[PDB]
Amino acid sequence: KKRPSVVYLHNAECTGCSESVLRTVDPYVDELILDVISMDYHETLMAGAGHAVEEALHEAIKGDFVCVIEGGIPMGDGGYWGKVGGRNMYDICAEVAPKAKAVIAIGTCATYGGVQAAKPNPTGTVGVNEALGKLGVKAINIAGCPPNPMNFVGTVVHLLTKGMPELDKQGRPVMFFGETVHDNCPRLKHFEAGEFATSFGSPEAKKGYCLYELGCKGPDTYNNCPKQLFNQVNWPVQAGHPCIACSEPNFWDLYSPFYSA
Amino acid sequence: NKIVVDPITRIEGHLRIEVEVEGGKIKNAWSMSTLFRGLEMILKGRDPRDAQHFTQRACGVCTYVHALASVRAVDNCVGVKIPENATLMRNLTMGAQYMHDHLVHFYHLHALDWVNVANALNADPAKAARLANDLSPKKTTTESLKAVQAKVKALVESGQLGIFTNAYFLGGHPAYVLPAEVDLIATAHYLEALRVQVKAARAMAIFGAKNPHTQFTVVGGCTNYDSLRPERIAEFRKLYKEVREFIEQVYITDLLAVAGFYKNWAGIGKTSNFLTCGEFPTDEYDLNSRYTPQGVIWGNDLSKVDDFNPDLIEEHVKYSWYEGAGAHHPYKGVTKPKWTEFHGEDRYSWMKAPRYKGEAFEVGPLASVLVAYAKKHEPTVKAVDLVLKTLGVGPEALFSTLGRTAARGIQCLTAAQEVEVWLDKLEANVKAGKDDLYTDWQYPTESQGVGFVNAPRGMLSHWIVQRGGKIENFQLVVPSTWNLGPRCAEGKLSAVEQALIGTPIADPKRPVEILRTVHSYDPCIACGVH
Ligand code: SF4
Ligand code: SF4
Ligand code: FCO
Ligand code: F3S
Ligand SMILES: [Mg+2]
Ligand code: NI
Ligand SMILES: [O]
């Protein structure tokens, strides 16, 4: 029918990737769901439950759709760690993803593995392209934990209006992830001036100096936080907390301990 | 015969419900949590200062609450006394989290089990607007209502129903009884709540940096000096008032109205044993300095409220996918996942089974509201009365699925009422020049600490054991672990399983009566299992 069809899968996730979505503005989620796309399968918002919803996913995948995958895919010991309907998450994805016109990995968990993939990765979770790359899935990676609503919706609409966005080697659309947070950070003035906070309760902290010494991973993170803001109102560094590199592969291990450079 | 609902939709995470019916009534029940992430295993040996960032990710719906319980558990195990402004700011952020959480649950997660959206198409908009106008002080027009009806029509007419595909009310359902005119007021409010939720989240982001997943808290206090500006408090204050008004004038009024056509649910899904740790302290080291009180109700006896004793908590694994059958207090918790398949060795859940002094308990808005009310918390007492008075029932109507649902409405407003108090103080302190948000701290050689949070879904506690500034043990015991966990070693039914027994099922092929009960608990499977 009319509006392009979207099938939204939930794997090893926290659901913060779907709540980020509900935060979209211009368009609001109502305009999105009723005028831009057809949300055919979405566990969190569905009216019917049990088999009524599985019959829906089943018929939607017979058509032309875009697949949205939230969460990492558990693969250790066979992947029984994550089940929907009694079926392992990897089995559902292996079936759905390859029939889609495009696959979009939402959240650092779907893109790279995420929180459950930090050491020692009890469940063997992996991102989408690592799990399904061999079934031919090449997903667009919208990184962040969670990503800015703008980067996911702006990619859906792009995909639907202009085509496939140019990606970086990490799979992220360069239009949103092409510059580091540091390059757009307003505390850059302090940085350039050689003015740093070495403690949270100090006068420098109160003056909004650079958090580099306090572990800001801004110089290493690709995201558009400073320029887009979150909730149209704030971002970590503005709230005086350093950037934790939440849009980067393996941040959990690579960038922790968080409060030390 | 059995009825299995998998997936249960309109919840957070992966849940499967299996029930045994006999004479049209649920006779047995099993709550099956089907995803394991293993956050406590990942924490092992890390820096306690990192915990908060990992734990926060146990759930993005009840975002922030785990950051708080973690920073409270490390604050406690290091003996730090955070400044008053960090206490106020942590409280405002939680207040805003209740405002948001509750509103989204009622309308986008729960409404659809009581409301037939398709019937709204059969309402007379002028008659719907008149009724709406007799329910609250907010003026409604036909035209706005006619407009929502045109939206629904435009959608139905496209053939792409989206999230209404196979809804249980499609083509009528015997368990769905509201007039088409209430179905249209409720549909107009559901779309409206989608826009208010955006404002509630933005308000939280004023103190929290962002929503979902705040980033302004540290062990020792808070980091947000920027928001201490009059401009930023004014901003927050404006959004806060818009949202507050909507809960008082639309959420509450709609809640009582729908509940009014389903009074038989005031006798369905009953429980005994309620507990809370309270929330919103003045003294971070005193459960009794909390706005909403702490306490333990046994059975359904509101005349005797005991003292909450955390030493009485043990988590079971006899029917969960973990090694053996030992129950442990959280400081001595173990997380060794051992899968044995669905009902393999009768184990049926990735959730542990928390028991209090060996008994099964219910945590959440109902539990919280019953403790406050029994302890005579005025805000609470004035609010419970309004409700019973409005439904023309007594407090005994509170022990049910209906009660579990009105209590969330009550908890959402009392929190909302108090946000004004903390703001005001925060603001006066900044005006007087008192602007500190952080306290320095050092680690003891070896220490243990606990963080008690009363999240929107009930009692949350993070337990840490550190040695050398390295985590030896980190255990989370979440409200949904209490409500939705499997049976314990003594084979006792968790609160959801027990609430299920006796539920009548009209159409077993479309068993919304199980959803009404399961949803009243606001399950969060990501939180319950972590
Ligand atoms: S990327 Fe972060 S917010 Fe998204 S599902 Fe994973 S843990 Fe949650
Ligand atoms: S606060 Fe972080 S992102 Fe901003 S200038 Fe300093 S290091 Fe760069
Ligand atoms: N609320 C919330 Fe989430 C749950 N259960 C926790 O804490
Ligand atoms: S933590 Fe994530 S939200 Fe932006 S500021 Fe850093 S990339
Ligand atoms: Mg636990
Ligand atoms: Ni949760
Ligand atoms: O939650």
Coordinates of C-alpha atoms in Angstrom, one line a residue, chain B residues 172-503:
Chain B
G172 CA -15.6 -6.5 18.7
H173 CA -14.7 -8.4 21.7
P174 CA -16.9 -9.3 24.7
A175 CA -14.4 -8.0 27.3
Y176 CA -14.3 -4.5 25.7
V177 CA -17.3 -2.6 27.0
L178 CA -16.9 1.2 26.9
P179 CA -19.4 3.5 25.0
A180 CA -17.9 4.6 21.5
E181 CA -17.9 8.2 22.9
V182 CA -15.5 7.2 25.7
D183 CA -13.4 5.3 23.1
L184 CA -13.0 8.6 21.2
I185 CA -12.1 10.8 24.1
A186 CA -9.5 8.2 25.0
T187 CA -8.1 8.1 21.5
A188 CA -7.9 11.8 21.3
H189 CA -6.0 11.7 24.6
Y190 CA -3.6 9.0 23.5
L191 CA -2.4 11.1 20.6
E192 CA -2.2 14.1 23.0
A193 CA -0.1 12.1 25.5
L194 CA 2.4 11.4 22.7
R195 CA 3.2 15.1 22.6
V196 CA 3.1 15.7 26.4
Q197 CA 5.5 12.8 26.9
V198 CA 8.0 14.8 24.7
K199 CA 7.8 17.7 27.2
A200 CA 8.2 15.5 30.3
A201 CA 11.4 14.0 28.8
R202 CA 12.8 17.5 27.9
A203 CA 12.2 18.7 31.5
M204 CA 14.1 15.7 32.8
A205 CA 16.9 16.5 30.3
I206 CA 17.2 20.0 31.8
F207 CA 18.7 18.4 34.9
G208 CA 19.7 15.1 33.3
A209 CA 21.7 16.1 30.2
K210 CA 19.5 13.8 28.0
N211 CA 16.6 11.4 27.9
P212 CA 17.0 8.5 27.5
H213 CA 20.0 7.7 29.7
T214 CA 21.0 10.7 31.9
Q215 CA 24.6 11.7 32.3
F216 CA 24.9 14.3 35.2
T217 CA 25.4 12.1 38.3
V218 CA 28.6 11.0 40.0
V219 CA 29.6 9.3 43.3
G220 CA 29.8 12.5 45.5
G221 CA 26.9 14.4 43.9
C222 CA 26.0 15.9 40.5
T223 CA 27.8 17.7 37.8
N224 CA 25.2 20.0 36.3
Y225 CA 26.2 23.6 37.4
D226 CA 24.7 25.0 34.1
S227 CA 21.1 24.1 35.1
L228 CA 21.6 26.0 38.4
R229 CA 20.9 29.2 36.3
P230 CA 17.6 31.0 36.8
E231 CA 16.9 30.7 33.1
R232 CA 17.2 26.9 33.2
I233 CA 15.0 26.6 36.3
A234 CA 12.4 28.8 34.7
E235 CA 12.5 26.6 31.6
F236 CA 12.0 23.4 33.6
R237 CA 9.3 25.1 35.7
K238 CA 7.3 26.0 32.5
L239 CA 7.4 22.4 31.0
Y240 CA 6.7 21.0 34.5
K241 CA 3.5 23.1 34.8
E242 CA 2.3 22.1 31.3
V243 CA 2.8 18.4 32.1
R244 CA 1.4 18.7 35.7
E245 CA -1.8 20.2 34.4
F246 CA -2.2 17.4 31.8
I247 CA -1.9 14.7 34.5
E248 CA -4.4 16.4 36.8
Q249 CA -6.8 17.4 34.0
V250 CA -6.6 14.5 31.4
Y251 CA -4.6 11.5 32.8
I252 CA -6.4 11.3 36.1
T253 CA -9.9 12.1 34.8
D254 CA -9.6 9.5 32.0
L255 CA -8.3 7.0 34.4
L256 CA -11.3 7.3 36.7
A257 CA -13.7 7.4 33.7
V258 CA -12.5 4.2 32.1
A259 CA -12.2 2.5 35.6
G260 CA -15.8 3.5 36.1
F261 CA -17.0 1.0 33.3
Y262 CA -14.8 -1.9 34.6
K263 CA -15.6 -2.0 38.3
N264 CA -15.7 -5.8 38.2
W265 CA -11.9 -5.6 37.8
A266 CA -11.8 -4.2 41.3
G267 CA -12.3 -7.8 42.3
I268 CA -9.8 -9.4 39.8
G269 CA -6.1 -10.0 40.3
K270 CA -5.8 -9.7 44.1
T271 CA -2.7 -9.9 46.2
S272 CA -1.4 -9.7 49.8
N273 CA 2.0 -8.5 51.1
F274 CA 3.3 -5.1 49.8
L275 CA 6.7 -3.4 50.4
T276 CA 8.5 -0.1 49.7
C277 CA 11.8 1.6 50.7
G278 CA 10.2 5.1 50.0
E279 CA 11.7 7.7 47.8
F280 CA 12.9 11.3 47.8
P281 CA 15.1 11.6 50.9
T282 CA 16.3 14.6 52.8
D283 CA 18.8 12.4 54.5
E284 CA 20.5 10.0 52.1
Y285 CA 21.3 7.8 55.1
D286 CA 17.8 7.6 56.5
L287 CA 14.9 5.7 54.9
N288 CA 12.7 7.6 57.2
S289 CA 13.7 11.0 55.8
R290 CA 12.0 10.1 52.5
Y291 CA 8.9 12.0 51.3
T292 CA 6.9 8.9 50.4
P293 CA 7.4 6.4 53.3
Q294 CA 9.0 3.0 53.7
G295 CA 7.1 0.1 55.3
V296 CA 5.8 -3.5 54.9
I297 CA 2.1 -4.6 54.8
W298 CA 1.4 -8.2 55.5
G299 CA -1.6 -9.9 53.9
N300 CA -4.0 -7.0 53.3
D301 CA -3.8 -5.5 56.8
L302 CA -3.4 -1.7 56.5
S303 CA -3.6 -1.2 60.3
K304 CA -0.1 -2.6 60.9
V305 CA 2.7 -1.3 58.8
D306 CA 6.1 -2.8 59.7
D307 CA 9.6 -1.5 59.2
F308 CA 11.4 -2.4 56.0
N309 CA 14.3 -4.7 56.8
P310 CA 16.7 -5.4 53.9
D311 CA 18.3 -8.1 55.9
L312 CA 15.2 -10.2 55.1
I313 CA 15.7 -10.3 51.3
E314 CA 16.9 -13.5 49.6
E315 CA 16.8 -14.2 45.9
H316 CA 15.9 -17.8 44.8
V317 CA 17.0 -19.8 41.8
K318 CA 15.2 -23.0 42.2
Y319 CA 13.0 -22.4 39.1
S320 CA 15.3 -20.0 37.1
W321 CA 18.1 -20.7 34.8
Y322 CA 20.9 -20.5 37.3
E323 CA 23.0 -23.2 39.0
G324 CA 21.4 -25.1 41.8
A325 CA 18.7 -24.2 44.3
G326 CA 20.4 -21.8 46.8
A327 CA 18.7 -18.5 47.9
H328 CA 21.2 -15.7 48.9
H329 CA 21.0 -12.3 50.5
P330 CA 22.2 -9.8 47.8
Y331 CA 25.7 -9.1 49.4
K332 CA 26.2 -12.8 48.9
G333 CA 24.5 -13.1 45.5
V334 CA 25.7 -15.4 42.7
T335 CA 25.0 -15.2 39.0
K336 CA 25.9 -18.4 37.3
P337 CA 23.4 -18.8 34.4
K338 CA 22.7 -22.5 33.7
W339 CA 20.1 -23.0 30.9
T340 CA 18.0 -26.2 31.0
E341 CA 15.3 -25.2 28.4
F342 CA 11.7 -24.3 28.8
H343 CA 10.5 -26.1 32.0
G344 CA 13.9 -28.0 31.9
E345 CA 14.0 -29.3 35.5
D346 CA 10.9 -27.2 36.0
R347 CA 13.0 -24.1 35.6
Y348 CA 11.1 -21.5 33.5
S349 CA 12.8 -18.0 33.9
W350 CA 16.0 -16.0 33.5
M351 CA 14.7 -13.9 36.5
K352 CA 15.7 -14.8 40.0
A353 CA 12.8 -15.0 42.6
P354 CA 13.2 -12.4 45.4
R355 CA 11.4 -13.5 48.6
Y356 CA 11.0 -11.2 51.7
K357 CA 11.4 -13.1 55.0
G358 CA 10.6 -16.1 52.8
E359 CA 7.3 -14.7 51.5
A360 CA 6.4 -13.5 48.0
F361 CA 5.7 -9.7 47.8
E362 CA 4.3 -7.1 45.5
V363 CA 6.3 -3.8 45.0
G364 CA 5.2 -0.8 42.9
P365 CA 2.6 2.0 43.0
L366 CA 0.0 -0.1 44.8
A367 CA 2.5 -1.2 47.4
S368 CA 3.8 2.4 47.8
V369 CA 0.4 4.0 48.0
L370 CA -0.9 1.4 50.5
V371 CA 2.1 2.1 52.8
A372 CA 1.8 5.9 52.6
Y373 CA -2.0 5.7 53.0
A374 CA -1.8 3.4 56.0
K375 CA 0.9 5.6 57.5
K376 CA -1.3 8.6 56.8
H377 CA 0.6 10.5 54.2
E378 CA -1.7 13.5 53.6
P379 CA -1.1 13.9 49.9
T380 CA -1.7 10.2 49.5
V381 CA -4.7 10.1 51.8
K382 CA -6.3 13.1 50.1
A383 CA -5.7 11.3 46.7
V384 CA -7.0 7.8 47.6
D385 CA -10.2 9.3 48.9
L386 CA -10.8 11.3 45.7
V387 CA -10.6 8.1 43.7
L388 CA -12.7 5.7 45.9
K389 CA -15.1 8.6 46.2
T390 CA -15.1 8.9 42.5
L391 CA -15.5 5.1 41.8
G392 CA -17.8 4.8 44.8
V393 CA -15.8 1.8 46.2
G394 CA -13.8 1.4 49.5
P395 CA -10.1 0.7 50.0
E396 CA -10.7 -3.0 49.7
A397 CA -11.1 -2.2 46.0
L398 CA -7.5 -1.2 46.0
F399 CA -6.3 -4.9 46.4
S400 CA -7.1 -5.7 42.7
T401 CA -6.0 -5.1 39.1
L402 CA -8.2 -2.1 39.1
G403 CA -6.5 -0.8 42.3
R404 CA -3.1 -1.5 40.9
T405 CA -4.0 0.8 38.0
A406 CA -5.6 3.6 40.0
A407 CA -2.5 3.6 42.4
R408 CA -0.1 4.4 39.5
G409 CA -2.3 7.4 38.9
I410 CA -2.0 8.4 42.5
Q411 CA 1.7 7.8 42.7
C412 CA 2.1 9.9 39.6
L413 CA 0.4 12.9 41.1
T414 CA 1.9 13.0 44.5
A415 CA 5.4 12.9 42.9
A416 CA 4.1 15.7 40.6
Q417 CA 2.9 17.7 43.6
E418 CA 6.2 17.6 45.3
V419 CA 8.4 18.7 42.3
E420 CA 7.3 22.2 43.1
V421 CA 8.8 22.0 46.6
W422 CA 12.3 20.8 45.6
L423 CA 12.5 23.3 42.8
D424 CA 11.6 26.2 45.0
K425 CA 14.4 25.1 47.5
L426 CA 16.9 24.4 44.8
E427 CA 16.2 27.9 43.6
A428 CA 16.4 29.7 47.0
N429 CA 19.7 28.0 47.7
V430 CA 21.1 29.2 44.5
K431 CA 19.8 32.7 45.1
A432 CA 21.5 32.7 48.6
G433 CA 24.7 31.8 46.7
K434 CA 24.7 28.2 48.0
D435 CA 25.7 26.4 44.8
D436 CA 27.6 23.2 45.7
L437 CA 26.7 19.9 43.9
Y438 CA 29.7 17.7 44.8
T439 CA 31.6 16.1 47.8
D440 CA 35.1 14.6 47.6
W441 CA 35.5 11.0 48.8
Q442 CA 38.0 8.2 49.0
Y443 CA 37.6 4.5 48.9
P444 CA 37.9 2.4 52.1
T445 CA 40.2 -0.6 51.8
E446 CA 37.3 -3.0 51.7
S447 CA 33.6 -1.8 52.0
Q448 CA 30.0 -2.8 51.1
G449 CA 27.0 -0.5 50.3
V450 CA 23.4 -0.5 49.3
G451 CA 21.3 2.0 47.2
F452 CA 17.6 1.9 47.7
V453 CA 15.4 3.5 45.0
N454 CA 11.6 3.4 44.7
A455 CA 11.6 3.4 40.8
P456 CA 8.2 3.9 39.0
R457 CA 7.8 0.1 39.2
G458 CA 8.7 -0.3 42.8
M459 CA 11.6 -1.2 45.0
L460 CA 15.1 -1.1 43.5
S461 CA 18.3 -1.9 45.3
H462 CA 21.9 -2.1 44.0
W463 CA 24.4 -3.9 46.3
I464 CA 28.2 -3.5 46.1
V465 CA 31.2 -5.1 47.7
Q466 CA 34.4 -3.4 46.9
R467 CA 38.1 -4.0 47.8
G468 CA 40.8 -1.6 46.5
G469 CA 38.4 0.5 44.3
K470 CA 37.6 -2.7 42.3
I471 CA 34.2 -4.5 42.4
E472 CA 34.2 -7.9 44.1
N473 CA 30.4 -8.2 43.9
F474 CA 27.6 -6.1 42.3
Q475 CA 24.0 -7.4 42.6
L476 CA 20.8 -5.7 41.3
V477 CA 17.4 -6.7 42.8
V478 CA 14.7 -5.0 40.6
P479 CA 11.0 -4.4 41.2
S480 CA 10.0 -6.4 38.2
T481 CA 12.2 -9.3 39.6
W482 CA 9.8 -9.2 42.6
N483 CA 6.5 -8.9 40.7
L484 CA 7.3 -11.1 37.7
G485 CA 9.9 -13.7 38.9
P486 CA 9.2 -17.4 38.9
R487 CA 8.4 -19.5 42.1
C488 CA 10.9 -19.8 44.9
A489 CA 12.3 -23.0 46.4
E490 CA 9.2 -23.2 48.7
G491 CA 7.3 -23.2 45.4
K492 CA 5.4 -19.9 46.2
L493 CA 3.9 -18.0 43.2
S494 CA 5.3 -14.6 42.4
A495 CA 2.8 -11.7 42.5
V496 CA 1.9 -11.8 38.8
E497 CA 1.4 -15.6 38.8
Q498 CA -0.9 -15.3 41.8
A499 CA -2.7 -12.3 40.4
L500 CA -3.5 -14.4 37.4
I501 CA -5.3 -17.3 39.1
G502 CA -9.1 -16.8 38.9
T503 CA -9.1 -14.4 35.9

